[PDB]
Amino acid sequence: MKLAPYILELLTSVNRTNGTADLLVPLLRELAKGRPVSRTTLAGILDWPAERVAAVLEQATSTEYDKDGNIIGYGLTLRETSYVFEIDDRRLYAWCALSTLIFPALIGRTARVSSHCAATGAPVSLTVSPSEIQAVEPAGMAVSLVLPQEAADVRQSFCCHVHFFASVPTAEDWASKHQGLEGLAIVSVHEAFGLGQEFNRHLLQTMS
Ligand SMILES: [Br-]
Ligand SMILES: [Hg+2]
């Protein structure tokens, strides 16, 4: 299918203000270590004042913090979700299906991803590298997409509708009982991975 409007609206969304793109990649690489990330640690990596770092993060309303005020969730998260995302010996989680497909290229590591079909509850898993996916089980795995909304919180308007399914038929059956959700579409995990690749290329083509 035609992916340009998905890529465009997703890109538009992360350019909240200048900073997000350039903050996003180091933050993900820190979260991938499996521990909470301090605002000062980010500042060291970015060479920004911590208050600039906070100014970027305050625009991102779904950012998760722990009891110590450290960052534990931003696309990748230490707080349990349906999308398990393991790097090395650390279990991490992700906000949605497409996240799991995108973030391995950004952090430069292969991830072991596992979830459950949102229609049937069947387990699903794959290995996601910066350049390819492997071990897709079951092989006909599918992904739901919706159109992101620009000024909406990305987690509540996009991530919460973007799931893994055991198969395209299963997913399409499920989709026929959702309506009004703008841009709802079912694709194979391969097409979603390709989507994530175009997204990343565009997003990286515009950092410092
Ligand atoms: Br188009
Ligand atoms: Hg997402």
PDB file of C-alpha atoms and ligand atoms in Angstrom:
ATOM      1  CA  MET A   1       0.000   0.000   0.000  1.00  0.00           C
ATOM      2  CA  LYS A   2       0.788   3.719  -0.121  1.00  0.00           C
ATOM      3  CA  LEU A   3       2.908   4.560   2.918  1.00  0.00           C
ATOM      4  CA  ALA A   4       3.846   8.181   2.337  1.00  0.00           C
ATOM      5  CA  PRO A   5       1.064   9.627   4.472  1.00  0.00           C
ATOM      6  CA  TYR A   6       1.958   7.322   7.336  1.00  0.00           C
ATOM      7  CA  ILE A   7       5.634   8.258   7.117  1.00  0.00           C
ATOM      8  CA  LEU A   8       4.795  11.960   6.749  1.00  0.00           C
ATOM      9  CA  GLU A   9       2.450  12.088   9.750  1.00  0.00           C
ATOM     10  CA  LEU A  10       4.814  10.084  11.906  1.00  0.00           C
ATOM     11  CA  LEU A  11       7.736  12.360  11.032  1.00  0.00           C
ATOM     12  CA  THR A  12       5.661  15.467  11.558  1.00  0.00           C
ATOM     13  CA  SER A  13       4.742  14.202  15.004  1.00  0.00           C
ATOM     14  CA  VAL A  14       8.299  13.833  16.304  1.00  0.00           C
ATOM     15  CA  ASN A  15       9.256  17.258  15.109  1.00  0.00           C
ATOM     16  CA  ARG A  16       7.468  18.663  18.058  1.00  0.00           C
ATOM     17  CA  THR A  17      10.284  21.046  18.596  1.00  0.00           C
ATOM     18  CA  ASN A  18      13.886  20.975  17.519  1.00  0.00           C
ATOM     19  CA  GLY A  19      15.597  18.476  19.735  1.00  0.00           C
ATOM     20  CA  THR A  20      13.425  15.369  19.571  1.00  0.00           C
ATOM     21  CA  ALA A  21      15.227  13.621  16.686  1.00  0.00           C
ATOM     22  CA  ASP A  22      18.666  14.392  18.130  1.00  0.00           C
ATOM     23  CA  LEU A  23      17.570  13.422  21.641  1.00  0.00           C
ATOM     24  CA  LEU A  24      15.658  10.352  20.497  1.00  0.00           C
ATOM     25  CA  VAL A  25      18.558   8.199  19.317  1.00  0.00           C
ATOM     26  CA  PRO A  26      20.852   8.607  22.347  1.00  0.00           C
ATOM     27  CA  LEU A  27      17.912   8.217  24.672  1.00  0.00           C
ATOM     28  CA  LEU A  28      16.956   4.904  23.016  1.00  0.00           C
ATOM     29  CA  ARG A  29      20.516   3.685  23.155  1.00  0.00           C
ATOM     30  CA  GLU A  30      20.609   4.429  26.874  1.00  0.00           C
ATOM     31  CA  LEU A  31      17.246   2.810  27.595  1.00  0.00           C
ATOM     32  CA  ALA A  32      18.414  -0.265  25.686  1.00  0.00           C
ATOM     33  CA  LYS A  33      20.915  -0.865  28.487  1.00  0.00           C
ATOM     34  CA  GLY A  34      17.922  -1.842  30.660  1.00  0.00           C
ATOM     35  CA  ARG A  35      18.203   0.790  33.417  1.00  0.00           C
ATOM     36  CA  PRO A  36      16.487   4.102  34.138  1.00  0.00           C
ATOM     37  CA  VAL A  37      18.147   7.055  32.366  1.00  0.00           C
ATOM     38  CA  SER A  38      18.952  10.272  34.097  1.00  0.00           C
ATOM     39  CA  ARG A  39      18.305  13.645  32.515  1.00  0.00           C
ATOM     40  CA  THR A  40      21.958  14.541  33.302  1.00  0.00           C
ATOM     41  CA  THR A  41      23.295  11.457  31.540  1.00  0.00           C
ATOM     42  CA  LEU A  42      21.441  12.482  28.395  1.00  0.00           C
ATOM     43  CA  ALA A  43      22.858  15.990  28.766  1.00  0.00           C
ATOM     44  CA  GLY A  44      26.407  14.600  28.886  1.00  0.00           C
ATOM     45  CA  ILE A  45      25.856  12.668  25.654  1.00  0.00           C
ATOM     46  CA  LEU A  46      24.110  15.577  23.900  1.00  0.00           C
ATOM     47  CA  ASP A  47      26.090  18.378  25.491  1.00  0.00           C
ATOM     48  CA  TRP A  48      22.919  20.270  26.281  1.00  0.00           C
ATOM     49  CA  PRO A  49      21.853  21.989  29.500  1.00  0.00           C
ATOM     50  CA  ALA A  50      19.582  19.613  31.427  1.00  0.00           C
ATOM     51  CA  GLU A  51      16.733  22.148  31.251  1.00  0.00           C
ATOM     52  CA  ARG A  52      16.818  22.036  27.468  1.00  0.00           C
ATOM     53  CA  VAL A  53      16.641  18.243  27.773  1.00  0.00           C
ATOM     54  CA  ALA A  54      13.610  18.661  30.091  1.00  0.00           C
ATOM     55  CA  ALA A  55      12.018  21.141  27.653  1.00  0.00           C
ATOM     56  CA  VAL A  56      12.165  18.563  24.853  1.00  0.00           C
ATOM     57  CA  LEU A  57      10.770  15.796  27.087  1.00  0.00           C
ATOM     58  CA  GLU A  58       7.901  17.950  28.445  1.00  0.00           C
ATOM     59  CA  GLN A  59       6.524  18.229  24.859  1.00  0.00           C
ATOM     60  CA  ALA A  60       6.463  14.431  24.824  1.00  0.00           C
ATOM     61  CA  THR A  61       3.521  13.896  27.179  1.00  0.00           C
ATOM     62  CA  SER A  62       3.582  10.098  27.219  1.00  0.00           C
ATOM     63  CA  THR A  63       7.178   9.958  28.564  1.00  0.00           C
ATOM     64  CA  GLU A  64       7.330   7.562  31.524  1.00  0.00           C
ATOM     65  CA  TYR A  65       9.391   8.250  34.671  1.00  0.00           C
ATOM     66  CA  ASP A  66      10.011   6.077  37.755  1.00  0.00           C
ATOM     67  CA  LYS A  67       9.748   7.055  41.421  1.00  0.00           C
ATOM     68  CA  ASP A  68      13.207   8.617  41.264  1.00  0.00           C
ATOM     69  CA  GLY A  69      12.265  10.970  38.372  1.00  0.00           C
ATOM     70  CA  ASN A  70      14.457   9.136  35.876  1.00  0.00           C
ATOM     71  CA  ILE A  71      13.310   8.330  32.369  1.00  0.00           C
ATOM     72  CA  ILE A  72      12.100   4.710  31.978  1.00  0.00           C
ATOM     73  CA  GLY A  73       9.895   4.947  28.887  1.00  0.00           C
ATOM     74  CA  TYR A  74      10.176   6.661  25.532  1.00  0.00           C
ATOM     75  CA  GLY A  75       9.169   4.292  22.722  1.00  0.00           C
ATOM     76  CA  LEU A  76      11.326   1.732  24.428  1.00  0.00           C
ATOM     77  CA  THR A  77      10.277   1.210  28.004  1.00  0.00           C
ATOM     78  CA  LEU A  78      11.189  -0.603  31.205  1.00  0.00           C
ATOM     79  CA  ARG A  79       7.501  -0.688  32.137  1.00  0.00           C
ATOM     80  CA  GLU A  80       5.674  -3.805  30.989  1.00  0.00           C
ATOM     81  CA  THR A  81       3.678  -3.713  27.794  1.00  0.00           C
ATOM     82  CA  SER A  82       2.441  -6.343  25.289  1.00  0.00           C
ATOM     83  CA  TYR A  83       5.618  -5.917  23.201  1.00  0.00           C
ATOM     84  CA  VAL A  84       8.708  -7.518  24.694  1.00  0.00           C
ATOM     85  CA  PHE A  85      11.973  -6.270  23.299  1.00  0.00           C
ATOM     86  CA  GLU A  86      15.142  -8.004  24.461  1.00  0.00           C
ATOM     87  CA  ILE A  87      18.639  -6.753  23.798  1.00  0.00           C
ATOM     88  CA  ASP A  88      21.512  -8.815  25.224  1.00  0.00           C
ATOM     89  CA  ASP A  89      20.585 -10.049  28.722  1.00  0.00           C
ATOM     90  CA  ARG A  90      17.999  -7.329  29.376  1.00  0.00           C
ATOM     91  CA  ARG A  91      14.243  -7.576  28.874  1.00  0.00           C
ATOM     92  CA  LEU A  92      12.775  -4.273  27.750  1.00  0.00           C
ATOM     93  CA  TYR A  93       9.410  -3.444  26.265  1.00  0.00           C
ATOM     94  CA  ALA A  94       8.067  -1.253  23.493  1.00  0.00           C
ATOM     95  CA  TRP A  95       5.017   0.935  23.044  1.00  0.00           C
ATOM     96  CA  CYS A  96       3.745  -0.713  19.889  1.00  0.00           C
ATOM     97  CA  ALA A  97       4.455  -3.245  17.137  1.00  0.00           C
ATOM     98  CA  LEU A  98       6.086  -0.736  14.804  1.00  0.00           C
ATOM     99  CA  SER A  99       8.398   0.484  17.554  1.00  0.00           C
ATOM    100  CA  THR A 100       9.941  -2.997  17.740  1.00  0.00           C
ATOM    101  CA  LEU A 101      10.630  -2.841  14.037  1.00  0.00           C
ATOM    102  CA  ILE A 102      12.114   0.674  14.041  1.00  0.00           C
ATOM    103  CA  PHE A 103      14.270   0.886  17.117  1.00  0.00           C
ATOM    104  CA  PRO A 104      16.818  -1.833  16.295  1.00  0.00           C
ATOM    105  CA  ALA A 105      18.181   0.236  13.405  1.00  0.00           C
ATOM    106  CA  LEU A 106      18.291   3.333  15.557  1.00  0.00           C
ATOM    107  CA  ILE A 107      20.160   1.774  18.462  1.00  0.00           C
ATOM    108  CA  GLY A 108      22.317  -0.373  16.154  1.00  0.00           C
ATOM    109  CA  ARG A 109      21.476  -3.776  17.721  1.00  0.00           C
ATOM    110  CA  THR A 110      19.485  -6.912  16.931  1.00  0.00           C
ATOM    111  CA  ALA A 111      16.464  -7.402  19.171  1.00  0.00           C
ATOM    112  CA  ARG A 112      14.495 -10.451  20.143  1.00  0.00           C
ATOM    113  CA  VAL A 113      10.861  -9.364  19.916  1.00  0.00           C
ATOM    114  CA  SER A 114       7.869 -11.283  21.231  1.00  0.00           C
ATOM    115  CA  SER A 115       4.225 -10.532  21.762  1.00  0.00           C
ATOM    116  CA  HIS A 116       0.804 -12.129  21.455  1.00  0.00           C
ATOM    117  CA  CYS A 117      -1.669 -11.861  18.593  1.00  0.00           C
ATOM    118  CA  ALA A 118      -4.125  -9.124  19.462  1.00  0.00           C
ATOM    119  CA  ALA A 119      -7.003 -11.167  17.877  1.00  0.00           C
ATOM    120  CA  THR A 120      -6.257 -14.701  19.079  1.00  0.00           C
ATOM    121  CA  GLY A 121      -3.706 -14.423  21.880  1.00  0.00           C
ATOM    122  CA  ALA A 122      -1.313 -16.766  20.058  1.00  0.00           C
ATOM    123  CA  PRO A 123       2.362 -16.065  20.857  1.00  0.00           C
ATOM    124  CA  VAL A 124       4.350 -14.342  18.138  1.00  0.00           C
ATOM    125  CA  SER A 125       8.060 -13.631  17.908  1.00  0.00           C
ATOM    126  CA  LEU A 126      10.751 -12.477  15.575  1.00  0.00           C
ATOM    127  CA  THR A 127      14.344 -11.309  15.500  1.00  0.00           C
ATOM    128  CA  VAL A 128      14.775  -7.733  14.337  1.00  0.00           C
ATOM    129  CA  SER A 129      18.089  -6.403  13.070  1.00  0.00           C
ATOM    130  CA  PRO A 130      18.941  -2.941  11.731  1.00  0.00           C
ATOM    131  CA  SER A 131      18.752  -4.338   8.201  1.00  0.00           C
ATOM    132  CA  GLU A 132      16.391  -7.330   8.254  1.00  0.00           C
ATOM    133  CA  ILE A 133      13.957  -9.512  10.169  1.00  0.00           C
ATOM    134  CA  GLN A 134      14.399 -13.246  10.793  1.00  0.00           C
ATOM    135  CA  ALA A 135      12.734 -16.160  12.599  1.00  0.00           C
ATOM    136  CA  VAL A 136       9.279 -14.669  11.982  1.00  0.00           C
ATOM    137  CA  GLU A 137       6.963 -17.047  13.885  1.00  0.00           C
ATOM    138  CA  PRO A 138       4.315 -17.637  12.679  1.00  0.00           C
ATOM    139  CA  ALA A 139       5.682 -16.685   9.245  1.00  0.00           C
ATOM    140  CA  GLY A 140       2.533 -14.841   8.052  1.00  0.00           C
ATOM    141  CA  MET A 141       2.582 -12.357  10.950  1.00  0.00           C
ATOM    142  CA  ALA A 142       0.800  -9.055  10.358  1.00  0.00           C
ATOM    143  CA  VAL A 143       0.739  -5.530  11.787  1.00  0.00           C
ATOM    144  CA  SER A 144      -2.104  -2.978  12.113  1.00  0.00           C
ATOM    145  CA  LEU A 145      -1.457   0.624  11.200  1.00  0.00           C
ATOM    146  CA  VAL A 146      -3.367   3.799  11.742  1.00  0.00           C
ATOM    147  CA  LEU A 147      -2.668   7.342  10.630  1.00  0.00           C
ATOM    148  CA  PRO A 148      -0.905   9.317  13.324  1.00  0.00           C
ATOM    149  CA  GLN A 149      -2.484  12.607  14.430  1.00  0.00           C
ATOM    150  CA  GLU A 150      -0.128  15.575  14.525  1.00  0.00           C
ATOM    151  CA  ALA A 151      -0.700  17.355  17.846  1.00  0.00           C
ATOM    152  CA  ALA A 152      -2.038  14.294  19.621  1.00  0.00           C
ATOM    153  CA  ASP A 153      -0.018  12.298  22.095  1.00  0.00           C
ATOM    154  CA  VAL A 154       1.604   9.699  19.854  1.00  0.00           C
ATOM    155  CA  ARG A 155       1.135   6.873  22.335  1.00  0.00           C
ATOM    156  CA  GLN A 156      -2.610   7.322  22.695  1.00  0.00           C
ATOM    157  CA  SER A 157      -3.399   8.135  19.066  1.00  0.00           C
ATOM    158  CA  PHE A 158      -1.025   5.738  17.250  1.00  0.00           C
ATOM    159  CA  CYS A 159       0.923   3.217  19.364  1.00  0.00           C
ATOM    160  CA  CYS A 160      -2.147   1.834  21.164  1.00  0.00           C
ATOM    161  CA  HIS A 161      -3.676   0.752  17.808  1.00  0.00           C
ATOM    162  CA  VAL A 162      -0.557  -0.787  16.270  1.00  0.00           C
ATOM    163  CA  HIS A 163      -0.462  -4.494  17.118  1.00  0.00           C
ATOM    164  CA  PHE A 164       0.993  -7.830  15.993  1.00  0.00           C
ATOM    165  CA  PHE A 165      -1.377 -10.480  14.559  1.00  0.00           C
ATOM    166  CA  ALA A 166      -0.836 -14.197  13.806  1.00  0.00           C
ATOM    167  CA  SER A 167      -1.690 -13.650  10.175  1.00  0.00           C
ATOM    168  CA  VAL A 168      -3.054 -11.217   7.632  1.00  0.00           C
ATOM    169  CA  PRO A 169      -6.451 -12.943   7.345  1.00  0.00           C
ATOM    170  CA  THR A 170      -6.802 -12.935  11.149  1.00  0.00           C
ATOM    171  CA  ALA A 171      -5.848  -9.246  11.252  1.00  0.00           C
ATOM    172  CA  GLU A 172      -8.254  -8.278   8.468  1.00  0.00           C
ATOM    173  CA  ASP A 173     -11.088 -10.136  10.217  1.00  0.00           C
ATOM    174  CA  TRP A 174     -10.241  -8.102  13.386  1.00  0.00           C
ATOM    175  CA  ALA A 175     -10.045  -4.880  11.423  1.00  0.00           C
ATOM    176  CA  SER A 176     -13.547  -5.250   9.988  1.00  0.00           C
ATOM    177  CA  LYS A 177     -14.836  -4.830  13.566  1.00  0.00           C
ATOM    178  CA  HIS A 178     -12.990  -1.556  14.019  1.00  0.00           C
ATOM    179  CA  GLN A 179     -14.224   1.565  12.191  1.00  0.00           C
ATOM    180  CA  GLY A 180     -13.727   5.308  12.164  1.00  0.00           C
ATOM    181  CA  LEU A 181     -10.127   4.805  13.314  1.00  0.00           C
ATOM    182  CA  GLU A 182      -8.604   6.884  10.504  1.00  0.00           C
ATOM    183  CA  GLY A 183      -6.245   5.112   8.161  1.00  0.00           C
ATOM    184  CA  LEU A 184      -6.626   1.665   9.747  1.00  0.00           C
ATOM    185  CA  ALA A 185      -4.779  -0.840   7.494  1.00  0.00           C
ATOM    186  CA  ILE A 186      -3.374  -4.357   7.863  1.00  0.00           C
ATOM    187  CA  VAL A 187       0.031  -5.168   6.444  1.00  0.00           C
ATOM    188  CA  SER A 188       2.441  -8.084   6.669  1.00  0.00           C
ATOM    189  CA  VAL A 189       5.284  -7.681   9.142  1.00  0.00           C
ATOM    190  CA  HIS A 190       7.605  -7.344   6.102  1.00  0.00           C
ATOM    191  CA  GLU A 191       5.729  -4.367   4.757  1.00  0.00           C
ATOM    192  CA  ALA A 192       5.687  -2.762   8.249  1.00  0.00           C
ATOM    193  CA  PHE A 193       9.432  -3.319   8.551  1.00  0.00           C
ATOM    194  CA  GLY A 194       9.870  -1.610   5.179  1.00  0.00           C
ATOM    195  CA  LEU A 195       7.736   1.232   6.440  1.00  0.00           C
ATOM    196  CA  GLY A 196       9.969   1.548   9.440  1.00  0.00           C
ATOM    197  CA  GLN A 197      13.003   1.611   7.199  1.00  0.00           C
ATOM    198  CA  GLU A 198      11.663   4.561   5.118  1.00  0.00           C
ATOM    199  CA  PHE A 199      10.706   6.341   8.317  1.00  0.00           C
ATOM    200  CA  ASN A 200      14.195   5.901   9.755  1.00  0.00           C
ATOM    201  CA  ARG A 201      15.959   6.957   6.564  1.00  0.00           C
ATOM    202  CA  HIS A 202      13.885  10.158   6.455  1.00  0.00           C
ATOM    203  CA  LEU A 203      14.322  10.810  10.171  1.00  0.00           C
ATOM    204  CA  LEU A 204      18.149  10.277  10.039  1.00  0.00           C
ATOM    205  CA  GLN A 205      18.453  12.357   6.829  1.00  0.00           C
ATOM    206  CA  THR A 206      17.503  15.340   9.039  1.00  0.00           C
ATOM    207  CA  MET A 207      19.606  15.196  12.225  1.00  0.00           C
ATOM    208  CA  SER A 208      22.785  17.218  12.943  1.00  0.00           C
TER     209      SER A 208
HETATM  210 BR    BR B   1       0.060   8.687  -1.160  1.00  0.00          BR
HETATM  211 HG    HG B   2       4.741   3.868  18.409  1.00  0.00          HG
END
